[PDB]
Amino acid sequence: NYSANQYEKAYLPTYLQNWSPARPTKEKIAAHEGYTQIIANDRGHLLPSVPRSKASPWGIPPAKVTLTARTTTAADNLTKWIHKNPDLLNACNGLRPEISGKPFD
Amino acid sequence: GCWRELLRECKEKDTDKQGTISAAEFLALVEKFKLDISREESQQLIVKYDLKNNGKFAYCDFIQSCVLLLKAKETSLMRRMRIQNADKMKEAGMETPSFYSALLRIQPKIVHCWRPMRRSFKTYDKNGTGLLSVADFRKVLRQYSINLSEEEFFHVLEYYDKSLSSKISYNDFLRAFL
Amino acid sequence: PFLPGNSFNRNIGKERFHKSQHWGFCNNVRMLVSENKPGVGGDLLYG
Amino acid sequence: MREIVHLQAGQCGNQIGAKFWEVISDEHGIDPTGTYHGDSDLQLERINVYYNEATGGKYVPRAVLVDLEPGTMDSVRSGPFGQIFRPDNFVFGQSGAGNNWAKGHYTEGAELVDSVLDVVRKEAESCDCLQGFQLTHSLGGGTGSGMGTLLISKIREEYPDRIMNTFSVVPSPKVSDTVVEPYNATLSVHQLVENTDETYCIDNEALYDICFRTLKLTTPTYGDLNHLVSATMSGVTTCLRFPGQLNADLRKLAVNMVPFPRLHFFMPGFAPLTSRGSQQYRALTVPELTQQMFDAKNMMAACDPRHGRYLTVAAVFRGRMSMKEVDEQMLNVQNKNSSYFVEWIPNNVKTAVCDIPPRGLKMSATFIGNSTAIQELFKRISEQFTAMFRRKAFLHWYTGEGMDEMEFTEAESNMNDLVSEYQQYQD
Amino acid sequence: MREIVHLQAGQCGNQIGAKFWEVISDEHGIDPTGTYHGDSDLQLERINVYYNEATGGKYVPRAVLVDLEPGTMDSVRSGPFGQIFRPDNFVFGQSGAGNNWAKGHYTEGAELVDSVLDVVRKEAESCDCLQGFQLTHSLGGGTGSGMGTLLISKIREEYPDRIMNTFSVVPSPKVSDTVVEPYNATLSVHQLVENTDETYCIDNEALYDICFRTLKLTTPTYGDLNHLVSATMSGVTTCLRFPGQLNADLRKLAVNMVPFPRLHFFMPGFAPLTSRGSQQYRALTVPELTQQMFDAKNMMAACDPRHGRYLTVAAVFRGRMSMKEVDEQMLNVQNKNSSYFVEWIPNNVKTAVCDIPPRGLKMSATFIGNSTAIQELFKRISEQFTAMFRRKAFLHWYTGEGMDEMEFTEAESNMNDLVSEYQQYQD
Amino acid sequence: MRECISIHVGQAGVQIGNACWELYCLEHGIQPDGQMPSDKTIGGGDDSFNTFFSETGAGKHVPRAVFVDLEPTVVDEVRTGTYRQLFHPEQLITGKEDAANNYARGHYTIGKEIVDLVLDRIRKLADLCTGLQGFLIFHSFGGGTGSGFASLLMERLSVDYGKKSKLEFAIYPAPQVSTAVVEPYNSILTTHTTLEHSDCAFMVDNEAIYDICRRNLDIERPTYTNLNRLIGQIVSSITASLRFDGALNVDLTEFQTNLVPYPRIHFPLATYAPVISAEKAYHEQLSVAEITNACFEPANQMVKCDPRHGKYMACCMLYRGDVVPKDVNAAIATIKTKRTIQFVDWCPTGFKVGINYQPPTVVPGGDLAKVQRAVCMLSNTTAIAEAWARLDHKFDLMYAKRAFVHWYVGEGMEEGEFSEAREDLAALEKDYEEVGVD
Amino acid sequence: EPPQHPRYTSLFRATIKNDMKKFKTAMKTMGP
Ligand SMILES: Nc1nc2c(ncn2[C@@H]2O[C@H](COP(=O)(O)OP(=O)(O)OP(=O)(O)O)[C@@H](O)[C@H]2O)c(=O)[nH]1
Ligand SMILES: Nc1nc2c(ncn2[C@@H]2O[C@H](COP(=O)(O)OP(=O)(O)OP(=O)(O)O)[C@@H](O)[C@H]2O)c(=O)[nH]1
Ligand SMILES: Nc1nc2c(ncn2[C@@H]2O[C@H](COP(=O)(O)OP(=O)(O)OP(=O)(O)O)[C@@H](O)[C@H]2O)c(=O)[nH]1
């Protein structure tokens, strides 16, 4: 999942023809320690004490926008009309739009 | 300075094995250097380590248990615990760090270059078999500038030996400090 | 010349591809099954 | 006299040793049959670096091939230069590895080490004096590792006085093909770093990239990539077998290169490789050679010491040169990059100049470098271990083979040692 | 030796590069293939200041070309000279700018800066001693403006000792094609003033007026307009690559032209343009060349320098002349209008005498002047800026890129300060 | 050398064994007489066929397969049919009675007296076997009779030999289609009696085979002939590594290691991308990127599972024909970059790649295209919970009513087997689930 | 006990250090 190095032109949505960005990659890690002790038994059953991400996932109003200048109250409403939908804000490919903009006066 | 500065703080005193240090004068050590322990905890300490070897406070076990000793393993790289249990089992010489004041004095070399010495043990064809000759032990210690007096030899011999010559496993030594 | 990039492999119509079985084990030793073998898809060996 | 016997292991070794031997044979101008054409007396004389004589002017290569799956060797035999190799040095197993490092390391090697040692020492006695050996192999690719581990393990004490040069292919950072390759990799690299003197690390992604940047042909084969790597092979091996005002000994190079016993990992280089139009669009002079060679992108092993700093650099040029252009180029690049070298040591640059080029191109070269650009390779593999051994995935087979997690833990500790050791010295 | 590295940016440089390079090439008499033909020994001698020499008399133009729209690149590639350029130097991108200053200054260039700087550093090292670079672009056009603004800012710290000359076409006072063009212009000039040492102003309207007044040829091409501007550029570079009792250096010119660091814009000028019959009704002499050079009609940058008063001028005369007649010519004009010349400095002309003419006409000249005649451009662009910003129209794209107006504040302030300082000096 | 054995149990099996060998003679160029044409490859039965035949000085290739059936009908049919002169009469083992959809009927009533002949023929082929890497065992789950029989004979061979590979193919229970109300019983019985000796079992749903057969094969009245050519092409693909060469080559033991992580679960799923007709292909293009995307389209898996709701643990890609590693790795990188695909946090890499130069063939009367690029995809993913969930809920309800109990108890079993099966699958659900938990 | 000679400043020392310093000038100019 982590990224490659240097030769950073041949691995991009430039060639996926992706238009929904892939994943936040990186070349950033310190020397990890630990022998990587064992907490599974024979299958992938973690030992109970050690925690996991305990099945946190287990397994249209949205529109990219710049506030710029649309009537102030309408902008305030648009904030909510974009958010308050965690279902299309959380997972299943993330499903996350952005925001830009400036306030009014 | 929880290790070497406190080592020198211990060296400041001059009294025998059993009479380690008086509780009042160790409180004087506290006023020389306020400590990360709590007040009630130190109130416990000054008698929890005068339990052994007279009403004197026991830096003897205090220092080594707090920093040097570790009778467990480490999920996050204590850097080896290479699973070995031969000489720590018989162990005629129960852990008595005052009788083991050598270990109170030989730490820095290991705490900086255990890994070269960790290497050096197996470099003598150990084949992962564990123990290795006492003579080779002594000669490699002298090799890497770990001088060691004969009385210290006897201390550690009783510690990591009960019956006979044996060959004292290297990690069975290392887990003391490392 | 056989410098790198000078071999434009014979990547033209190649219908047959079958491989002979040029080696075997036999009894309790190992050696080369009787020398006369086809090459790749019916090729002929050197001489 | 002193000479080299070749060891070719695993199905990558098969690959590359095949193309490599035919490359050398064509370099000295021997027909694919074995009946010689006398052109160059010096190259006729220096045959004894590698070749043992056969009666009536035919010349065996002193190499030993070994694998498990017969069909790979069958294809190699059918290849254009198969007839040159011997039934004598053909030996392999009766089972497949499954790329199971445990099986190769203990199960199958145990009963073939006898024959392989027999054959290699037979060739050793047939020869007179040896510098060492070179092995070509993989580290995540199963069978080659599973045998070479024991091979080097024994040969180490069989000859504590010789030079065990090795060339291994390295897993791709982007896609590693075989899923258990990381496990195989650490298991290999333990004994590798413990025993060897030198190691050459290369990967196929960079080869892809050089293909697109200068080959431009968009349709190469693994054989073409092998052509590149075997050309580098020959380039480093040139000096022994040719006159010139320069040193040849692998030891004469290693003593210059390696500062401390723990350093055994090295990183190649190649000279102007010419595209379709660059043949007539390149002005062929030593300054632009120097540049193009010691270009960061022109590197092809793993990843750019751009992040880090160069420790030692060696470069061997091949052709009709003069000293002073390379001298001024060395000073130019030295001033050009002082930070990337360590005040620890100036003049970390060593060169060599051998007169006879390859055939067809005028002046070429080969570069080799040791810098702080390898940390991240085994850093990568280490996160894979922390992640997959987090659950003993795919580990039941190894338990069944009879192994314990001990064997893995000592390796992870050693590798952590090496990582910290680099970072500490380089800073 | 001292040489130049030529840069083409944006969909104007797209043409100017072609026209300018073909001008130099056919001036030096080399076939469209690049194989040299000996005609002018001296130009052969001095060719090194621009070209590099490959093997076999082939001559690459050390030109680096960047773009986001590859179609114009296809045209330039197809043209009757495009085969003369090297593929090693065609750095480009995958998408277009959308003719957005904000995009072309922050988003798209973020991933091409690397490669462009790598190519330029390769060529800069390859060459020996640099006076500087010349940049062909257009402040009125988006894509070139963005890439130029980024690249000049970088090269300022890269090579802080050199001459970063830039040529550009300021938008028409009557119609600007691009409508957000005044934003583009203000944001471009904000870094132009800081970074550039010297910039040429040209206007296509004035080109059209020249075509009406003198060319009379009804049906021109943008290529012919480019021909005239290429004549101007060739003229300014004539002096360096030829003998003559004159001071060629651009720094000669710069210290002689620029009194203070806040004055970098300059106005071109070319010499005798003849109509269909004036070639044989115009007796070719020095006084009439001088008179036509100093015309309200020849001058073609933005508008007549009539409104303001001159500050300095530099003239180069190319051909067989004497020096005395130009001397009394400048005497004559000096006394003619000693009132329009500033009284800060007397005798504010630098005259240079290049010997070898352009092929076709015996005598020729070129003019570069600096007067108090920029107030018009910058005042007008200021009022248009304030007018279209008095309701922040078209600001949504820039804010969507992520751009705020706090920066526009100091931008417009800086242009106001330049105009005010002009006024303070000249009056 | 590199060779394996072939086993077919049931009318369910000899079907597609017939299909497979029908194909396997064509591409290698055999005439149904059994003797090679005027050209020369005959001898001790050692040329490329040798991995599947032994054309000894007899002159005839002999398939290394045994066709065991409880019922004489189909075996007599194939004996009277075309390929008998190829076939070896008695290795067409036939019985007199049917297990009558009763797992225990097949496991006790009949299995005792025929497994002897089975194992004897197995050994009398094993003697001449040299490499004997593994086996191709063909059976089903909703078996009319083959299920328990296959389970018990597999037990016999698993206890006699344990140092090789065993490959398992069974048509998976059609989700909402049944030809047996005893199907959940006999399925789960097979499952808990086989979970602990097998190596690699792969599934398929013939409903979906049909569903693609009219999605792009463009026929509304397909047949078993069409389904069987598809699956025979799959087995030809898996054996192509043995049959031919290439840049790099992979084997069954590599499969068994690389695909399955852990014991218990060893049940991944297959897919074949370029299933296309000549008429459709006439004016379209085929190449690596789109064939990869097609093979990973959510509805091109021939079993009812969702990538989106599942999560991947393994993928092996087998390419045949004319390709290059360049665009191979490019396509695989695009796959990794995609978001819809959600690999578990376990596998850093997830892709066993194998390449062969050799393009697959076609058959006259066959209805595939004339393709130049073939890919076989084998994936292990969490998307298969719903199958066994459906099975267990159906079974638990109709066992709560406990009908057909009388059948099994009368023939001499009890419910304890059922209890063990229930607790086994109850384990296996959370077995699939907490590994996904991350 | 022989005293090691005070390394004589035959000029050089920090002077030659600065000399080599002012040749080691190109730091970044090839890879940023
Ligand atoms: N001849 C040949 N070798 C290749 C080719 N492509 C890759 N190889 C490499 O050969 C490597 C390993 O060589 P071996 O040591 O013989 O492999 P192994 O021990 O049998 O384990 P596996 O890699 O699973 O085969 C593989 O990991 C590949 O990376 C190729 O195209 N031709
Ligand atoms: N190539 C070309 N350029 C022209 C032509 N006519 C005018 N130009 C000028 O080219 C200038 C800009 O060139 P670039 O820097 O490449 O422009 P840009 O960044 O792509 O932004 P845009 O001008 O909006 O396309 C414009 O200001 C035009 O005035 C023409 O016919 N061909
Ligand atoms: N192998 C195979 N399976 C088929 C075929 N047609 C349908 N099937 C499926 O395969 C299963 C066949 O199993 P059974 O009918 O029980 O065969 P059997 O167990 O060997 O014994 P019988 O009751 O005598 O048929 C059915 O459940 C079908 O879903 C076919 O031609 N071949």
Author numbering:
A (entry chain O2): 4 to 62, 74 to 119
B (entry chain Q2): 1338 to 1515
C (entry chain G5): 4 to 50
D (entry chain MH), E (entry chain LH): 1 to 427
F (entry chain MG): 1 to 438
G (entry chain L3): 20 to 51
Provide the authors' original text about this structure.
Inside the sperm axoneme, a pair of microtubule singlets termed as central pair complex (CPC) are surrounded by 9 microtubule doublets (DMTs), forming a “9 + 2” architecture. In addition to α- and β-tubulins, we identified and modeled 36 different kinds of MIPs in our intact mouse sperm DMT reconstruction.
The A-tubule was resolved at an overall resolution of 4.5 Å with the local resolution up to 3.6 Å in DMTF16, and an overall resolution of ~6.5 Å in DMTF48. At the high-resolution region of DMTF16 map, well-defined side-chain densities of distinguishable residues facilitated accurate assignment and modeling of multiple MIPs. We used findMySequence30 to identify the most possible candidate sequence of each MIP based on the complete mouse genome, yielding the successful assignments of 18 MIPs in the DMTF16 map with high confidence scores.
